[PDB]
Amino acid sequence: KLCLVCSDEASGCHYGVLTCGSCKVFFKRAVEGQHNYLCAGRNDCIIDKIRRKNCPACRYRKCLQAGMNL
Amino acid sequence: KLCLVCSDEASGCHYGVLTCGSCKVFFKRAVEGQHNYLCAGRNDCIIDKIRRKNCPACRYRKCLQAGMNL
DNA sequence: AGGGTGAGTCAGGATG
DNA sequence: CATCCTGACTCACCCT
Ligand SMILES: [Zn+2]
Ligand SMILES: [Zn+2]
Ligand SMILES: [Zn+2]
Ligand SMILES: [Zn+2]
């Protein structure tokens, strides 16, 4: 069972998609919050257990593309 | 520790009252749907883990008497 | 990051 | 067969 966003240990199927606890709370905070997410690279960053902190923009984009939805 | 409605092991404070999980959802289904239950005894049926299924009418009365409420 | 509680779903048993 | 009632499982939100 791996998080379809960051490949960390999946806890269940949250907001329609198999994901870990951190990606669950990240996504909800991203949808509802006011954030200024901008990628410092090419909108194609590697998202894994460590790197996921680096680019919220690409993390959020991957959540959306994997089909996450409130 | 014990459900105030059927004396089974309580799982938490549900709808205002210390109850087991099954009495929790029993009550929720009784207050939203119809609760036109008939007791086949004398309205004092024994409600315990083994017998709580026999008399929804007496089970529902014990939920109300214990103070359960949405 | 995790406990507490509400709510949806599913399957199984009893019933018709 | 189908329908109804039950309770365990899973996930939601809220607060710490
Ligand atoms: Zn993740
Ligand atoms: Zn990026
Ligand atoms: Zn109970
Ligand atoms: Zn009764």
Burial (CB count within 10 angstroms: exposed 0-12, middle 13-18, buried 19+), residue A60: buried
- Taking CA atoms, A34 is separated from A29, A30, B19, B59, in Å, by 9, 7, 40, 48
Q: Taking Cα atoms as reference points, which of A49, A40, A53 lies closest to residue A9?
A: A49
Dist. CA B15–CA A65, nearest whole Å: 39
Resolution (A): 2.2
Angle at the Cα of A43 from the Cα atoms of A2 and A26, rounded to 5 degrees: 45
Dist. CA B59–CA B70, nearest whole Å: 17
CB A30 within 8 A of CB A67: no
Angle at the Cα of A52 from the Cα atoms of A46 and A55, rounded to 5 degrees: 80
**3-state secondary structure (DSSP) of residue B31:** helix
Dist. CA A45–CA A61, nearest whole Å: 10
Dist. CA A59–CA A67, nearest whole Å: 13
Domain B1-70 part of CATH 3.30.50.10? yes
- Answer whether any strand D atom is within 7 A of the Cβ of A11: yes
Method used to obtain the model: X-ray
User: Whole-number Å distance, CA B53 to C1' C12?
Assistant: 15
Q: B51-59 long-range contacts, Cβ below 8 Å, gap at least 24?
A: B52/B5, B52/B6, B52/B8, B52/B22, B52/B23, B52/B26, B56/B26, B56/B30, B59/B5, B59/B6, B59/B23, B59/B26
- Answer whether any strand D atom is within 7 A of the Cβ of B21: yes
User: Whole-number Å distance, CA B27 to C1' C3?
Assistant: 24
- Answer whether any strand D atom is within 7 A of the Cβ of A24: yes
